[PDB]
Amino acid sequence: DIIIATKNGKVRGMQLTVFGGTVTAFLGIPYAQPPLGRLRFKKPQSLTKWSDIWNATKYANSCCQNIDQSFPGFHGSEMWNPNTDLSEDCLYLNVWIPAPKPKNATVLIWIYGGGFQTGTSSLHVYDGKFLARVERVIVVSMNYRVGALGFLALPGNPEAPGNMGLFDQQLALQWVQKNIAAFGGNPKSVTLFGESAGAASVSLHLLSPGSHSLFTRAILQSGSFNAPWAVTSLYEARNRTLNLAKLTGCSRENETEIIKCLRNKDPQEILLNEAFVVPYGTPLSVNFGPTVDGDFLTDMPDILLELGQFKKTQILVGVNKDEGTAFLVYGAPGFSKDNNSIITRKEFQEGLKIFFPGVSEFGKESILFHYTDWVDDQRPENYREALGDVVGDYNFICPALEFTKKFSEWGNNAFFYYFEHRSSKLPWPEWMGVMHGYEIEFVFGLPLERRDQYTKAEEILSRSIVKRWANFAKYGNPQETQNQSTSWPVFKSTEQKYLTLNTESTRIMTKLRAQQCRFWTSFFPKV
Ligand SMILES: *[C@@H]1O[C@H](CO[C@@H]2O[C@@H](C)[C@@H](O)[C@@H](O)[C@@H]2O)[C@@H](O[C@@H]2O[C@H](CO)[C@@H](O)[C@H](O)[C@H]2NC(C)=O)[C@H](O)[C@H]1NC(C)=O
Ligand SMILES: *[C@@H]1O[C@H](CO[C@@H]2O[C@@H](C)[C@@H](O)[C@@H](O)[C@@H]2O)[C@@H](O[C@@H]2O[C@H](CO)[C@@H](O)[C@H](O)[C@H]2NC(C)=O)[C@H](O)[C@H]1NC(C)=O
Ligand SMILES: O=C(NC[C@@H](O)CNCC1CCCCC1)C(c1ccccc1)c1ccccc1
Ligand SMILES: *[C@@H]1O[C@H](CO[C@@H]2O[C@@H](C)[C@@H](O)[C@@H](O)[C@@H]2O)[C@@H](O)[C@H](O)[C@H]1NC(C)=O
Ligand SMILES: *[C@@H]1O[C@H](CO)[C@@H](O)[C@H](O)[C@H]1NC(C)=O
Ligand SMILES: *[C@@H]1O[C@H](CO)[C@@H](O)[C@H](O)[C@H]1NC(C)=O
Ligand SMILES: *[C@@H]1O[C@H](CO)[C@@H](O)[C@H](O)[C@H]1NC(C)=O
Ligand SMILES: [Cl-]
Ligand SMILES: [Cl-]
Ligand SMILES: [Cl-]
Ligand SMILES: [Cl-]
Ligand SMILES: [Cl-]
Ligand SMILES: [Cl-]
């Protein structure tokens, strides 16, 4: 019976047997007044004390979201859909503390991705119990508002200022600072980490002044704010907001009377209309995303990045080999998870219109010109792999690399990795490679469970990754000092060294996707 006194009330956890050991889990602790009623679309409000003992012993509600139904019954898609009830009342967080209760444990705060439209902390591949048991860190994850409920934007107007889900995240970081001391954790040693939109979120907390004092270091997995999907412009946000009013018959003239109208609507009416607020959409469509609100973000972030306006600290950044493949089976012609998707030059050009809709005829041509200069013109996989690389390089790898260059130019230590191992339990087909999001299980130490059908070499890779991640959190240095590991060097803007993670080797390489990223970063923004 482990009851902890938090600043808002007592909470009861539960005991977990992990690897012939023990971990104390606290699941679904509230951290804000539920944003229901007049609180929908508003920034989160601080909780009043409760007198009972809160039973934080099961995952809480996930936040409202549109589920991926593109491959029903398919684990590869459904492993990401929420595994608890959806509710507007969803601002809750979880804590895993090692047993015995530690003294001054480094805290790890996880933020999930999902395109800022979906995601939940209760996912099986976000279970922190392993990291607590193995590395005696404290793992924390929070739920935050996604989609229009968490990012509907009417800038200036506090009834929908934007970035509510980011302010959800930021409230939880606060909760840790005031309470994690009571759990054995060190508020002075908090490492943010996240993946995809979670990773974009982490980069934005590096830029938001109101988050500078709430964490120490940060790890960014396949995601950064400077990626083309991560920030909604003020133009897009208004057309999208206004469109969502038309789709609900909430079009009004007084800007506030519009919000009030959307607040008597049921969550499903708002969820259903989110698809169509963009006329033409891409598969990577973040209909309601982070914006330059003037509260969380004070300027456009690409400027702040360029001019050094961020928390000075260490960062750990990386990407996966085949980031782009996942998106090709969500709309690209000639593709499917159920064949090798050999496409033609015509299907390739067609796919560019899918992923680059509002782009000039000359822009699409330039993408084709730079990726379809093959070594062997006879290779049949040529156009299939090229569309994956296009998507992955444009949407993840080159923005992540550019973030890491820019951030490092102000003197902080950065470390870049390149995850290139395909999971043995990967459910998608093999032509899709080292897919977006399939390092997460390795980072959380799921292959450490022998009773799980993971190969042996996959255990060892997860163990070294979990070491390097934990050593980065505790010490700002992601090394594995004991088992004669390859030393991970700092990313410098000159040499641009990075570390490869695979089961065979661990190599030091330089200047990832060099040719590819001079195109996406120096040529293509001109179009
Ligand atoms: C800004 O939004 C308008 C409205 O777009 C539509 O809104 C809903 C009716 C929705 O269900 C979708 O059909 C649309 O997103 C955009 O105007 C539309 O533009 C498309 C082509 O761009 C045209 O075929 C439609 O007939 C137009 N409909 C209306 C009502 O105007 C407009 O393009 C958006 N501005 C942008 C994207 O810059
Ligand atoms: C690979 O499959 C795609 C996807 O088509 C679907 O999935 C298949 C496995 C099968 O169930 C089809 O009946 C499905 O429609 C194929 O793309 C389709 O190709 C057909 C014939 O060329 C065409 O009529 C459809 O319009 C295409 N649909 C889409 C969405 O692209 C593709 O031809 C297959 N290629 C290979 C090499 O197997
Ligand atoms: O995550 C998207 N939507 C949510 C949902 O519907 C399907 N995603 C599931 C993801 C969960 C976490 C990370 C791995 C997969 C969407 C996206 C947009 C922008 C940036 C990244 C991802 C997307 C669209 C097509 C294929 C994969 C992902
Ligand atoms: C919280 O739970 C209390 C009982 O917990 C029970 O006993 C402990 C030792 C565990 O075994 C647990 O799984 C059991 O359910 C209730 O008495 C109490 O009323 C509950 N509080 C609330 C607010 O529901
Ligand atoms: C924990 O670490 C900080 C420095 O990181 C130190 O000041 C503090 O005294 C330590 N102990 C406790 C109980 O917080
Ligand atoms: C809109 O309505 C609210 C509430 O009645 C009011 O406070 C606000 O001033 C109004 N704005 C305009 C422009 O009429
Ligand atoms: C190093 O090897 C030993 C086995 O001798 C193992 O117990 C330990 O966990 C390994 N450490 C890492 C980080 O792989
Ligand atoms: Cl899984
Ligand atoms: Cl490669
Ligand atoms: Cl050809
Ligand atoms: Cl899996
Ligand atoms: Cl390369
Ligand atoms: Cl060029």
Q: What does the DSSP assignment read for 206-225?
A: HH-GGGGGG-SEEEEES--T
Q: Which CB contacts under 8 angstroms, 24+ apart, belong to 271-277?
A: 271/64, 271/65, 271/66, 271/147, 273/244, 273/247, 273/248, 274/66, 274/117, 274/147, 274/148, 274/244, 275/66, 276/243, 276/247, 277/239, 277/240, 277/241, 277/243, 277/244, 277/247
> How many DSSP H helices and E strands does the chain contain?
17, 14
Neighbours of 86 (CB within 10 A): 17
Q: How far is the CA of 277 from the centre of ligand 1 (A)?
A: 8
CA of 253 to the centre of ligand 6 (A): 10
User: By C-alpha distance, which of 24, 292, 316 is closest to 195?
Assistant: 316
Q: Decide the pairing of beta strands 92-98 and 217-221.
A: unpaired
CA distances from 467 to 38, 460, 464, 477 (A): 46, 11, 5, 10
With the most atoms of ligand 5 within 8 angstroms of its CB, the residue from 188, 215, 216 to mutate is: 188
Evaluate: CB of 1 within 6 angstroms of ligand 4: yes
Q: Please name the residues in contact with 72: beta carbons below 8 A apart, sequence gap of 6 or more.
A: 78
Method of structure determination = X-ray
**Buried b / exposed e along 92-115 (16+ C-beta atoms within 10 A):** bbbbbbbbeebeebbbbbbbbbbb
436 is catalytic: yes
Q: Are 195 and 224 in contact (CB under 8 A)?
A: no
For residues 245 and 238, the answer to whether their CB atoms sit within 8 Å is no
Which residues participate in the annotated binding site for substrate? 114-115
Q: Would you tell me how many other CB atoms lie within 10 Å of the CB of residue 425? A: 14
Question: Which residues are CB-contacts of 527 (< 8 A; sequence separation ≥ 6)?
Answer: 359, 360, 362, 363, 366
3-state DSSP assignment of residue 399: helix
**Angle between the 234-247 and 255-263 helix axes, to the nearest 10 degrees?**
60
Sign of CA dihedral 245, 247, 252, 258: negative
Query: CA-to-CA distance for 334 and 350, rounded, in angstroms?
Result: 10
Q: Is 75 a catalytic residue?
A: no
Cα(215)–Cα(81) distance, rounded to whole angstroms? 29
Q: Tell me which ligand sits closest to the C-alpha of residue 186.
A: 5
- What is the rounded CA–CA span in Å between residue 511 and residue 91? 41
Residues 6+ apart with CB under 8 A from 69: none
Q: Is the peptide bond before 427 cis (omega within 30 degrees of 0)?
A: no
Phi, psi of 510 (to 5 degrees): -130, 135
Q: Residue 110 and residue 169: Cα distance in Å, rounded?
A: 10
What are the two backbone dihedrals, phi and then psi, of residue 134, each rounded to the nearest 5 degrees? -80, -45
77 belongs to the catalytic site: no
Residue nearest to atom 10 of ligand 5 (CA): 104
Cα dihedral sign, 296-297-301-307 = negative
Q: Cβ distance 459 to 442 under 8 Å?
A: no
Annotate 284-296 with DSSP letters as a single string.
S--SS-----SSS
Q: How long a stretch of residues is the chain?
A: 527
Asked if 228 and 324 count as a contact pair (C-beta separation under 8 A), the reply is: no
Which residues have CB under 8 Å from 244's CB, separation 6+?
Answer: 148, 152, 250, 262, 270, 273, 274, 277
Copy the structure tokens of residue 507.
């190599």
> How is 405-427 classified by DSSP, letter by letter?
HHHHTTT--EEEEEE----TT--
Q: Which residues are CB-neighbours of 430 under 8 A, at least 6 positions away?
A: 422
Q: In what order do the strands lie in the sheet with 9-12?
A: 3-6, 9-12, 53-55
Distance CA 432, CA 102 (A): 42
The one catalytic residue in 88, 236, 323, 402 is 323
**3-state SS track over 54-120:** EECECCCCECCCCCCCCCCCCHHHHCCCCCCCECCCCCEEEEEEECCCCCCEEEEEEECCCCCCCCC
Residue 29 and residue 13 in contact, taking contact as beta carbons nearer than 8 Å = no
Q: What tokens were used for 440? A: 């997460």
Resolution in A: 2.8
Tell me the one-letter amino acid at 20: G
Tell me how far apart the alpha carbons of residues 91 and 109 are, in angstroms, rounded to a whole number.
15
Residues β-bridged to residue 109: 140, 192
- As a whole number of angstroms, the distance between CA 411 and CA 429 comes to 42
Structure tokens at 165: 């889900």
3-state secondary structure of 126: helix
Q: Which of 256, 257, 258, 261 to mutate to test the pocket of ligand 6 (most atoms within 8 A of CB)?
A: 256
C-alpha count within 13 angstroms, C-beta hemisphere, residue 190: 25
Domains contained in the chain, CATH given: 3-327+392-518 (3.40.50.1820)
Pocket lining: 463 vs ligand 7, CB cutoff 6 Å: yes
Closest by Cα among 2, 138, 117, 18 to 62: 117
Cα 172 to Cα 29, 46, 133, 164, 169: the distances in Å are 10, 10, 23, 12, 5
Residues 205, 218 contacting (CB under 8 angstroms): yes
Q: Which atom of ligand 7 is nearest to the CA of 467?
A: 13
- Which atom of ligand 5 has the smallest separation from the CA of 181? 14
Using CA atoms, how far apart are residues 401 and 491, in angstroms rounded to an integer?
A: 10
With contact defined as beta carbons under 8 Å apart, do 459 and 450 qualify? Answer: yes
Best residue for ligand 7 mutational test, from 130, 443, 459, 463 (most atoms within 8 Å of Cβ)? 463
Of the residues 121, 122, 141, 196, only one is catalytic, namely 196
Question: Is 126 in contact with 25 (CB distance < 8 Å)?
Answer: no
Buried b (16+ CB within 10 A) or exposed e, 323-333: bbbbbbbbbbb
Q: Does residue 186's CB lie within 6 angstroms of at least one atom of ligand 5? A: yes
Tell me how far CA of residue 167 lies from CA of 110, 160, 238, 294, in angstroms.
Answer: 15, 12, 20, 13
- Closest ligand to Cα 461: 7
> Ligand 11 center to residue 307 CA distance, Å?
40
Q: Which residues contact 43 (CB under 8 A, 6 or more apart)?
A: 158, 161, 164, 167, 295
Distances (CA, A) of 88 to 77, 143, 145, 166: 23, 11, 8, 16
* Residue whose CA is at the smallest distance from ligand 4 atom 8: 1
Sign of the dihedral through C-alpha 174, 179, 181, 184: negative
DSSP labels for 464-502?
HHHHHHHHHHHHS----TTTTPPP-PPP-TTT-EEEEE-
Cα(135)–Cα(471) distance, rounded to whole angstroms?
9
Report how far apart the first and last C-alpha atoms of the chain are (Å, whole number). Answer: 62
- Contact present, 153 and 198 (Cβ < 8 Å): no
Give the three-class secondary structure for 262: helix
Residue 323 CB partners (closer than 8 Å, separation 6+):
222, 391, 392, 393, 395, 396, 397, 435, 436
Q: Retrieve residue 371's tokens.
A: 């990726």
- Given a contact cutoff of 8 angstroms between Cβ atoms, the answer to whether 184 and 102 are in contact is yes
Burial (CB < 10 A; 0-12, 13-18, 19+), residue 16, is: middle
Coil vs helix vs strand at 401 = helix
Using CA atoms, how far apart are residues 460 and 37, in angstroms rounded to an integer? 49
